[PDB]
Amino acid sequence: QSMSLQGKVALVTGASRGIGQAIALELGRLGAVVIGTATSASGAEKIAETLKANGVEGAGLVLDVSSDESVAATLEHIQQHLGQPLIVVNNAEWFDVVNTNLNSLYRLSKAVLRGMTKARWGRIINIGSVVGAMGNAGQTNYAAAKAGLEGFTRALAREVGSRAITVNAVAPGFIDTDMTRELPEAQREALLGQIPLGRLGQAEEIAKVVGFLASDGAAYVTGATVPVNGGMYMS
Amino acid sequence: LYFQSMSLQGKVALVTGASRGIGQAIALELGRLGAVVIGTATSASGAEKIAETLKANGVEGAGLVLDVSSDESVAATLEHIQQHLGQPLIVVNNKDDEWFDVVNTNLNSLYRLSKAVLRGMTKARWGRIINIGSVVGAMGNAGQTNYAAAKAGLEGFTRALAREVGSRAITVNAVAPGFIDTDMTRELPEAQREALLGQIPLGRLGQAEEIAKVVGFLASDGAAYVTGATVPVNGGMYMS
Amino acid sequence: MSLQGKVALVTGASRGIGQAIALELGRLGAVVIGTATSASGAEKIAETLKANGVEGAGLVLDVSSDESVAATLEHIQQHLGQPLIVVNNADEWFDVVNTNLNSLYRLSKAVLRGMTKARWGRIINIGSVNAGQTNYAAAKAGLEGFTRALAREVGSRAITVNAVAPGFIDTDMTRELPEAQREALLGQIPLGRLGQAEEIAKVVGFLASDGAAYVTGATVPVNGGMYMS
Amino acid sequence: QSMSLQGKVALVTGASRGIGQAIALELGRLGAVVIGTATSASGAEKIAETLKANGVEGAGLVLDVSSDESVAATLEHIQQHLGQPLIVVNNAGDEWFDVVNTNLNSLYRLSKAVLRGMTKARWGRIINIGSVVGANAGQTNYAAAKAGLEGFTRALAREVGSRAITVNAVAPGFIDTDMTRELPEAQREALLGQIPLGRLGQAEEIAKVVGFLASDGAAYVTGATVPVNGGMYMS
């Protein structure tokens, strides 16, 4: 009725598995034409099979977000064949890590903005990292990137707002993915002891939110980091 | 028999302060997602108006009189609601020195009501509590103080209540409106508007519906791993 | 001796953190009025002041009760003078937090008449130290917000309002918790130790100082790196 | 009583003017041996004159924080002559991304460098100074760097804490500096109408806080960003 993204071309990066794939399908299912990407050809192929499998119009694709060449090429390629994407979704020593992420977020976001600017409409949606038990160190990085995301996101939202382009972030919590499904029994129950709802979040649950923010309904929402974590907040 | 799947069909929502603007927009948006909807006001004139508006938009439900500050109103209102319609599981709560009294009163009320409706959500092992912030309400620096002060209370309160309740699959979330198209704003000087819109990255006021849509979202089953959160709806203008 | 000729009021100063604040203020030349909820307490405070050469007075005060507050201040004023450094350090989560802030309000309101005349003041609010996680965060949220609001409402009159947020502090309650739950918890504090009460005091003392006069509405976290929300 | 910084060697970057200089003197005044730096020889010479002038033992110095060579050289130079600095103070503050990215890398570079020394001594202070507010785009950057500082500062505090080294940030507000002191009379009163205390902050007022954090008293304070702004808070 009104959660229709019909006739809108979405771009989901890192969409071969878990959260990213869940975002891809959810966007399609809301009528989006959907371009999922991965770092490899094998990956990009897989994505397409999965789209066709669920009736979603679109295309798998190979993209290295760290490399300008890839980005410039990928977009150019996308534009000609499918159209210009207006819903763009970024999915993916603490210093190096965080520094690299935000530069990428930047690189890509910058690239896609020319297109959103012409159309005077856009959605950028940035996905946080999942919580993962690498100990004391795990707590440091999680918080560090989550801090970067929040800040970054809000800044970029301020810089584009005049052109009716929202920018928002989603901060997953302890999510049921391939990564989590094989962590030690201890670090699981310890961590569930910290989540008020007492379960992991399913990828779909992230997707749904992503889908929301994409919608026209959530058009006065910009610069915001929606926490999806069943109540476990870390700061 | 009716027997639905993807939206709020067969769920009884309660929206407080639903006669005007933001609250009414929430009421309709819930109805439109199939909710059976109980809007309330502080007066009979108000409660009657709400019902007219529901019928007008085909929404099943009832206008109702409720004083959130007074325990017995609350106890009575819920009791009434339960028997006739059912138990609500989606419940939606809608110059400086003032700031303490204002904020104190709100949270006590938020508490009172929330407590009341929880007995029901607990039996059903499912719920949604959704708390609406105040709108940016004056200019001045005093406006800045109160706005921030309630927005701070809401954020904190919301998150706390989410923590004491989460076991029972009941989300608690808040929505923080920005500068929203209202009576207050509709009659301001031609300067203080554009100055203020120079403050909002998106360059416009938020329509009530825009708040509603988010409310509606959080209500949905999709947004079931979202709890204790305060979603800012403000077109980019952030204040503390 | 940098708060010389300034009359400080420290609530809940018989033990641990509050007492540490009391002494630290005295030591910076403050005339110091410590309070407790009982006569036995108030007596003790005075002994301790004398013991450390600090001019001032122990006193009985129920912060929840307007009568006490109005009376206590009146009493203080006549005998010692008007306090301009005032330091608040005296299911369940809502009641708890609600009560605290109302008290913070009550008292703060009371002492402001005095600071306003003098066009100078310090209000310093001290934070508390599964369910434990909920309340800790809940009051800490209230304190931060409350503090900042009140700072906005008084600023014109050169009165700072600030908060201090203790972490895991070495006090009576903590010093005897199980050997396991200590090391587990120290594994969460980056600095690897508990905070001594004095460490809070030193900050309190700082904020009191004229140096920290452009610092208002702020909540200084004293927690050795362990941050929680 | 007695609580100063005697026998401790402090390093203040960008200490020729305003806030940085105020920090330099305040540290000296608390007995610190003090090494102020600037980007030029003219600057570095001036700093020394000012130290002598106020009886403070130490040295002016030339340092480009963006360039590894400078940093490695400067520290080496400092160490053999004066000693190893254990109080280190970083003073500094479309294009919001580049700006903030550059700052934090620098904060990183230097902080890393000086940590070898603090680690040997099992004691340290790192103190990071935020940028001053200037009165739209100003709002974006101010918030953006203030966000980076807060986050960065915390993270680094988490990574060094075991070694009894605090890391803290100070967030100046609208401060009376040469930069601010020549803005229009209108935009002054308008802005003071936004600061609860109704005045600008003097550099010294920052310094005093810096001095505090340096002290042994503020040793259980780490990862924190102390706001010095007379009540005007922005995000």
Ligand SMILES: c1ccc(-n2nnc(-c3ccccc3OCc3ccco3)n2)cc1
């Ligand atoms: C002024 C400024 C902030 C606040 N609060 N910020 N957070 C809270 C709060 C957080 C969790 C649970 C309850 C809370 O409010 C208790 C309260 C205190 C005064 C009135 O209501 N209160 C209250 C008054």
Ligand SMILES: c1ccc(-n2nnc(-c3ccccc3OCc3ccco3)n2)cc1
């Ligand atoms: C570690 C911890 C926090 C952060 N940041 N927190 N916020 C930001 C940030 C916010 C808005 C714009 C840019 C930001 O950082 C860019 C960056 C981070 C690292 C390298 O370059 N970064 C960076 C590294």
